[PDB]
């Protein structure tokens, strides 16, 4: 980003993502509703600490010079005129604005001063989430296996990238010619062999992921139906202003039909359980929404 | 040991010494039989007052800790330090769950409202601020003091907060409407410490001062204010009048409080002594050579017969009462 | 102010227009245009050129009418008593109440607010006015001619700059809520950046980047967006034309999204500046990594 | 869709389907309130509840204090008419998000369906809409569910029949409001308060006439007293038109009479041209509620005494609106 | 407002006087909603006064008005006189009606 | 002793009116506000 | 920003708190009250007359 | 009380750039002080394992450090032939006593807190004044390098262990060796006496008979490079029990604060805690990857710290 971002996330996942990214940099979470927002802002500006500010709908115009980067360089210092006092702006300072209302309106100057980042739910993401949820609920072993394989594939790809980079670095760093020093040959042989077993692990994890994909194909229509149902729920606000439903409502409906379903007490067949889950999903969605 | 008459006695029980800097304040845990002391080494050590055994240290503050307090349940500890920060401690897990900034200078006092959902603090920038426990947001800023505000203490029901400052005055504020109910100005020097009168002493205070019984039935909140002119004054918040002046300390008064039974006044000063006052006769009964240097604070346990006094000699002492 | 600015013909014309009014007595500006178009920055730059002192009210959430009155008292005391040339740059978003507009209307029209100074403030103002008159060389003792001199000094020294977005209904409402805003103020319609301005900004900013392709083939149907684009365009000119088309595409996208009933965020010239900055940074980074 | 024809089961939903952090938004069309339902729910669940009426600054103060106390003590809080403070509603929604209340804590926000209610609060809580029941069967089921069982089953065995007749009368009167020019002359506020007043009148006069006797003769029931009271004060109080009063009197003399205890009494006549509604022969609450549940799903304005074509234009309009709604959010 | 209604209700309860409040819909809707609480408390205090088990030798029946315990005389009553035909008048909340 | 220390800030432009204003401030604080003031001043501060 | 001040024979009696180092610690590290403003003193400051 | 270190560790404190020689506990504060061979003394906080400061006044390798009863002073000795007195409030060297020729091995302050005792290669023990710094009386009798020296609980009795196979106990008043013990198989290196909490516990452990006065008399403990720990009687001078089982050279011995178990380290790379009354608790605990040099027991807190040659100081919980 060039302009300081403004995050729109009703679910609140983006806020936690930002706090996790800047946790090592000692990010401070505050709000415009806090009376002492000035003190936190000044401390962040002076010490160059990342800052996350919530409730941007109550935006404080004191941030206008900060957002506009209206700095005054003089004598090696970078001065920012927050209010009536001058503050040495550390280059490591960064501010993120966040809100949980996707329907909030902003004045044009605020729209100009920030980089809007909208975290909206998509059909593919919702389908993936619902598929993962149903796999965890009905086939916990398969879900655990899938998580383990995703972790292993991530680690294996990291290892392959590191090995390729190290091999290129070693070939670049030779002060002379390869066979002059045997340690170069040792390093190249080690890197190539490591790439070998990591690749073999890649094919074995790939075939296990293939069987995991095959066993999970049965629950895809349920995830598609979940996405369609939720996006019908979200579009219900077009016919009446009172029909405001969040993603957490549909997630609660899905959790109720999965775990708190009275019709799954004695049923053990997977196909029967899936059919019951679909029927009761439609029934519970209508019952709760209407 | 009369269930509401014990006073501390010169044979000390334990003299706990683990602090590397002068002890600022000492308090008692309302529920557990545990004692907490804050010092100037940015540490908040936790002691057991029955066996006199150190338990653990609560670090995290950058500069000297100036005040500590517990909520009614004892499940939260609020501490303020000289680094302009107020920290909320989860006393079950002994971790700092929230750090609150916003004061412009040294914060010299902190207290948790009786409802437990707000934190009141006083600092050197001549302001008193109120913070939410859940969110940590500042919601009020009681301005009006002309100098460094040293103490802030809410009353029993939490509707009133009293404060003392270097401006030689004691102010009583209304939490709901932020107005200054009264400005008690009779001390000739800087006021150090204040304390509210418990409901169990209202009748005793009314009969000692000769105050006629009000037709409302409530004698009105009573306030004490130890100051550096070596005097202790009892006030009537409703009328703004000084009921009595207690004389007898040889130096600046650092702490003052009532006996939980509401029959005596316990106060510590920089004259190295801890004194028990009989406000019925406006005279001092017993004087204890508490420490070998200045005595910074004292606390009186609500039920158990025990008194704790912190001091600048880096020693925290527990006194048996008989 | 250490903020880079790209200069095109419209910026030069606008700074000339602003400099003209700032040299006139009782000269007030009414700058109308999309936010982020440089109105405040240009006003501050011109005020610095003419020696004016830029004053802006530091509005916040708790800002109220008394704070506005005290800011007005401060700026009037500086402008009249101290004989200081002040450019009072005030934005529409700074108006939290109709009392703000009433005070502003009175100040622009008469040059003085009859009820702003009272009690101790009035006496302090009168003593300061006496000191200023003694400094200037005038002999004034009674309060009436002192106030007249203060009003004359404020008229000669104080300049007020008004910046607001082009809202038709808002403009019509302000035409009646603040009559002096349209009679005592010179209305300059900055508007949004035109196609020529966007093209010039793109050309100036992307000058450092290579953007050179000798074997570039000019298409038979060139999607000409800038009217004055050369007939045999070069690769750089085509790139800048594409950037201008991207900006216009966002404009059309918001137009369509508002037509369907959706919620739209206005595109400002700051969006174009971010776009060109991102283009330059990405070009440099990709070239370096590839090499 | 048969689940929505039954009265709302607030107990199960509040106990299980509602998290403590989620406020229970209970929107109601004008003429209906959900405060009584929640007060009854708290009474039957022996749970202390604090009810605060929004509209004053000290009202907001008590609301804040009650919420702060209840999130820790696990009590219930009612805030009625919250639609009058949209900004305070936004502040409350922001406060509720950063909150970890007790497991038994519940917050009920009683408001009417107003466009000024913040969208974020609507998304934060669970909405329940209270409105006229769709059918005569549904209305009578709601009436029977609201009235306690012990209240109906008193010493006189004729009390159950009187309560059933009153429920049928209330359903007929309230359902005629859907046809504003034909059913009445204007949208009268015939609601739950009128039903409670009528039930109290029935209880008082039955106790006065029957000195604890197990059974009373149908002609000894004070028919004139009940008819006059329900025509003058309870239901006729809101009526300001002489012909609306005449219609109410006609209904009262048709229903509240000694013939209503006969086996061949007809609640309605020629509803479909041949069949007519028949008075149940039961003498207890259970038989009457079973008969109510056994009512046919098909309903026509002839049940209310109106012509069968009184709903043709209304049904066509609702069909067109349904088509437009389906087309609008495709 | 709420405070004036509370003080008037306290006076009526202590005196035992009938309160006829003409043009009651000229109040603000929020004020009517707030006043509904005081009216409901007064009505509940009157209702518990009328039960047979109450004895005059026991403590007098009191209700919570303006954060105070005020005695409620059985003789008092609250009447509101209104004309809903005037446009611009407030609409009384359902809990008040 | 609790006294409030007051020291006049002299400079090159410090003249009689500034000293009069400082004296007025000290007298107002010590006579109207009942504030104990230790007015510390040095012979170098006596410019006239 | 180390500072060099010439013409010390016209010494301005405002550096007296600066020259005497009349600072107070805590509440912002080093605090200097130059006149009526509580300035935060930079440890790298040095003045030559 | 019955505290016993556990195999899990809390912190592995590594700040020294040369092998750690001795580690001690502050008498009152929650402070750990470690002396190493890089001429530096480092200060740690054992509760949270945070480095605090270093005392780099010494020239050569620092050998032994000791506090006083109040913990207000720190006496240190090094191979640079000098003894440095450290003022623990300002952490600055305040008195540097010279003499006492060649590498100084041990240093200790009597509970009186007015005089200091030190040992060195020059086969003699010197006595210093903390107030002035003058060696008033010099102790002679050791024929070889003296390794460790330790006083009593009231500043009257002193024992010194040396390479000459002798552990000989001395008196302040008459400056005479009342008890001389030459019976170890190889060189004795570490000594530490018995607190008053363990005088009664010896009676049923050894069956010793009380004298006419009834007091069991002062006891002696001495670990020797012959892999044996032996606990002695100062009053008489006879052996009471021999503890055998250390794999390699022993480096430091001391008694549990409760006076019930024996806790000592050795060059066997492991920390071994032993019971002497009943020979029951024979726990062996691996502590360091390399030779273990010194150790200490907190008087009240359930913490023990060990110094090793592997550049690290480790803190163990007690349970
Ligand atoms: N001609 C320009 N060239 C480059 N940047 C500009 C130019 N004009 C405005 N800006 C950008 O706009 C910001 C200031 O906008 P501002 O003038 O406050 O908007 P408004 O005109 O709505 O007051 C600056 O940060 C600057 O980067």
From Swiss-Prot, chain E:
Subcellular location per the Swiss-Prot or TrEMBL entry: Cytoplasm, Cytoskeleton
Membrane-spanning parts: none
Protein family membership: Belongs to the dynein heavy chain family.
Recorded disease: Charcot-Marie-Tooth disease, axonal, type 2O: An axonal form of Charcot-Marie-Tooth disease, a disorder of the peripheral nervous system, characterized by progressive weakness and atrophy, initially of the peroneal muscles and later of the distal muscles of the arms. Charcot-Marie-Tooth disease is classified in two main groups on the basis of electrophysiologic properties and histopathology: primary peripheral demyelinating neuropathies (designated CMT1 when they are dominantly inherited) and primary peripheral axonal neuropathies (CMT2).
Record text about domains: Dynein heavy chains probably consist of an N-terminal stem (which binds cargo and interacts with other dynein components), and the head or motor domain. The motor contains six tandemly-linked AAA domains in the head, which form a ring. A stalk-like structure (formed by two of the coiled coil domains) protrudes between AAA 4 and AAA 5 and terminates in a microtubule-binding site. A seventh domain may also contribute to this ring; it is not clear whether the N-terminus or the C-terminus forms this extra domain.
Subunit structure: Homodimer. The cytoplasmic dynein 1 complex consists of two catalytic heavy chains (HCs) and a number of non-catalytic subunits presented by intermediate chains (ICs), light intermediate chains (LICs) and light chains (LCs); the composition seems to vary in respect to the IC, LIC and LC composition. The heavy chain homodimer serves as a scaffold for the probable homodimeric assembly of the respective non-catalytic subunits. The ICs and LICs bind directly to the HC dimer and dynein LCs assemble on the IC dimer. Interacts with DYNC1LI1; DYNC1LI1 and DYNC1LI2 bind mutually exclusive to DYNC1H1.
Known function: Cytoplasmic dynein 1 acts as a motor for the intracellular retrograde motility of vesicles and organelles along microtubules. Dynein has ATPase activity; the force-producing power stroke is thought to occur on release of ADP. Plays a role in mitotic spindle assembly and metaphase plate congression.
Protein name as annotated: Cytoplasmic dynein 1 heavy chain 1
Organism for this UniProt entry: Homo sapiens (Human)
Lineage: Eukaryota, Metazoa, Chordata, Craniata, Vertebrata
Gene encoding the protein: DYNC1H1
Curated annotation (Swiss-Prot), chain H:
Effect on the protein of changing residue 78 to P: In SBH; abrogates interaction with NDE1 and reduces neuronal migration in vitro
Region (Interaction with dynein and dynactin): 1-319
Primary location group: cytoplasm
Cellular component, GO annotation: 1-alkyl-2-acetylglycerophosphocholine esterase complex; astral microtubule; axon cytoplasm; cell cortex; cell leading edge; central region of growth cone; centrosome; cytoplasmic microtubule
Keyword Cell inner membrane: no
Effect of residue 58 to R: In LIS1; abrogates interaction with NDE1 and reduces neuronal migration in vitro
Position of the signal peptide: none
WD repeat coordinates: 15-56, 57-96, 99-138, 141-180, 183-242, 245-286, 287-319
Modified residues (Phosphoserine): 18
Entry GO MF terms: dynactin binding; dynein complex binding; dynein intermediate chain binding; heparin binding; identical protein binding; microtubule binding; microtubule plus-end binding; phospholipase binding
Keyword Isomerase in record: no
Protein origin, superkingdom: Eukaryota
Key words, A-Z: Acetylation, Cell cycle, Cell division, Coiled coil, Cytoplasm, Cytoskeleton, Developmental protein, Differentiation, Disease variant, Lipid degradation, Lipid metabolism, Lissencephaly, Membrane, Microtubule, Mitosis, Neurogenesis, Nucleus, Phosphoprotein, Repeat, Transport, WD repeat
UniProt-annotated stretches for the region Interaction with DCX: 276-318
Swiss-Prot/TrEMBL GO biological process terms: acrosome assembly; actin cytoskeleton organization; adult locomotory behavior; ameboidal-type cell migration; auditory receptor cell development; brain morphogenesis; cerebral cortex development; cerebral cortex neuron differentiation
Interaction with NDEL1 as annotated region, ranges: 297-319
Subcellular location: Cytoplasm, Cytoskeleton; Cytoplasm, Cytoskeleton, Microtubule organizing center, Centrosome; Cytoplasm, Cytoskeleton, Spindle; Nucleus membrane
Family the entry assigns: Belongs to the WD repeat LIS1/nudF family.
Domain topic, free-text comment: Dimerization mediated by the LisH domain may be required to activate dynein.
Associated disorder: Lissencephaly 1: A classical lissencephaly. It is characterized by agyria or pachygyria and disorganization of the clear neuronal lamination of normal six-layered cortex. The cortex is abnormally thick and poorly organized with 4 primitive layers. Associated with enlarged and dysmorphic ventricles and often hypoplasia of the corpus callosum.
Described purpose of this protein according to its UniProt entry: Regulatory subunit (beta subunit) of the cytosolic type I platelet-activating factor (PAF) acetylhydrolase (PAF-AH (I)), an enzyme that catalyzes the hydrolyze of the acetyl group at the sn-2 position of PAF and its analogs and participates in PAF inactivation. Regulates the PAF-AH (I) activity in a catalytic dimer composition-dependent manner. Required for proper activation of Rho GTPases and actin polymerization at the leading edge of locomoting cerebellar neurons and postmigratory hippocampal neurons in response to calcium influx triggered via NMDA receptors.
Name of the molecule in the record: Platelet-activating factor acetylhydrolase IB subunit beta
Native organism taxonomy: Eukaryota, Metazoa, Chordata, Craniata, Vertebrata
